[PDB]
Amino acid sequence: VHVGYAVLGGAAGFAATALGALMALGLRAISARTQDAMLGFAAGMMLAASAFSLILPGLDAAGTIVGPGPAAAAVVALGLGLGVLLMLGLDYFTPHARVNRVWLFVLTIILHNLPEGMAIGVSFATGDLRIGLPLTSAIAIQDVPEGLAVALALRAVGLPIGRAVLVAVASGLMEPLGALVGVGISSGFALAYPISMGLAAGAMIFVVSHEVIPGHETTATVGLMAGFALMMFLDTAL
Amino acid sequence: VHVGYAVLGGAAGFAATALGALMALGLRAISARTQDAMLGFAAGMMLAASAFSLILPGLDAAGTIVGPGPAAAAVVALGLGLGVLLMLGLDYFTPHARVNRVWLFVLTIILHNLPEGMAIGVSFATGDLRIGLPLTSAIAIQDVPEGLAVALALRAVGLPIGRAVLVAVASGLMEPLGALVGVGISSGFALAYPISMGLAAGAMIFVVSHEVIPGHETTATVGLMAGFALMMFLDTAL
C-alpha cells in the first residue's frame, strides 16, 4: 500500500536526522558561519522540494483530476494557502527557566519537522515513486545537517552533548509520524492529493520563511543557492 | 602519517565508486538525459574541487613557502600547466572487436580516475584535514553517480550487468593508488606541495574539458551548476 512507501520514506527521514545528530558528538561546537551555511542549504533544499516536488506535481495531479483550466491551479493554490494558515495557527496556539526554554526550542524543532514528514507521506500517496523518491531523498539529505545543527544548538543552550544528541534523535521521530499523517489526509478523496500537495508545500514555505529570519548573511545564501541547485539536479535526474 | 589520511581518503573514493556501481544492478538502464545530468553534476564537483580545494589552497601554501609576490602563483600555475601537459601526454601515448573496445573504454575510465586519487593524496600531504577532508568528500560524492554511470555505460556497450558492475568496482580501485601517488609526489620538498596541488587541479580540469565534450545540453548544465554550487557550499562549511 501507499503507507509502505510513506513509512520507509519517514524512516529515512528519522535515520538521516539521527546521523546528523550523531555527528554532533564528535564536533560538540561549530562556528557561527558554518551553522548558518548548513541552515541555508537546508532551506534551499526545502524551498525547491516544495516547488519542484510538491507544487508542480500537485498541479499536474489536479490537472488530470479536474482538467487543464484554472480549477486545478486553484485547488493546489488553496491547499497551499491552507498550509500557510495552518502553520500560522500553530505558532500562535503554540509557545516557543533554562529547563523551559529548552522545551520551547524543542517545540520549535517539532513544529519545524511536522510539514516535512507530511510532505513525504503526501508524495507517496499515489504510490508514485517518481514523486515520493526525489522528494523523500531531498528531505533526508537536508535532515542530516539539520540534525547536526539541532543537536549543536541544544548543546549551546546549556545541554550536555549526550542529552543534546538524544533529544535531536527523538526530534527526528516526528518525520514518520508526519508521514502517516500526510498519507492519511491525502487519501480520502481524489482532490485530497493535490490539496495535500499544496498544503505540504505551503507549510514548508512557512517554516522556511519563519526560520530564514536568522552579520552571517553572505554565507547562508551560498548554502541556500547550493541546496536549491542540488534540488533541481535531483528533480531532473529522478 | 600523511599516507594514513590519504589512504582513508582513497578508501572512501573506492567505496563510493562501488556504491554507485552496485546501484546499477537495480537499474540496468537509464535515460540519456539522466546520465547526462549525472555527468554534469560530476564535472561541476570536479571543476570547483580543483578551484576551491586545490588551486586556492595551493596558492596559500605556495605563498607561505616563497612569499606573497607572483613567485607563489607562478609555482601553482606551472604545476597546473604541467598537469594539463601530463594528461595530454597520456591520451596520446594511450589508446582509448567488442572485446577491445571495452578495453579502450576501461582505459578511459582509469585515465579519468588517476587525477582524482592523486588530488586526494595531495590534499592530505600536509595532514591538513581542512584541505583534504572537503576535497576528499567532494571526490566521493561525485564518485557515486560516476560509478553508477560507468557501470551502466559498460552494460550498454554489450556487457552483462554483473560484469559491468564488477568492472566499475575494480575501476574505483584506481583512487587509492592515485592517493598513494599524490602523497608521494607532494612530499619530496617544500614546493612539492603547491606544485602538486597545481598539478592535480590541472589534470582534473583536463579530464573534465576532455569529457565535457558530450541534444542533451540543457540537462548537463543543470547538473554542472548543481555540482559546482554544492562544492562552494562544502568549501564554506568545511
Numbering used by the authors:
A (entry chain A), B (entry chain A): 54 to 149, 162 to 279, 285 to 308
Show sentences the authors wrote:
The identified ZIP fold is unique and consists primarily of a transmembrane domain of eight pseudo-symmetrically arranged transmembrane segments (TMs) 1 to 8. Together, they form two separate helix bundles encompassing TM1, TM4, TM5, and TM6 and TM2, TM3, TM7, and TM8, respectively.
Overall, the metal-bound and metal-free structures are reminiscent, each displaying an inward-open configuration of TM1 to TM8. The metal-free and metal-bound conformations represent the structures determined here, while the outward-open state is a generated model. In the inward-open metal-bound state, release of the ion from the metal-binding region is mediated through zinc-binding residues, including D144, H275, and E276. Release is facilitated by the TM2, TM3, and TM7 bowl, lined by the invariant D144 and H275, and E276, as also demonstrated by our metal-bound and metal-free structures. To investigate zinc-dependent movement of the transport domain, we aligned the metal-free and metal-bound structures using the static scaffold domains. The analysis reveals a considerable displacement of the transport domain, with the ion-free form being shifted around 3 Å toward the intracellular inside, combined with a substantial twist that tilts the domain 11°.
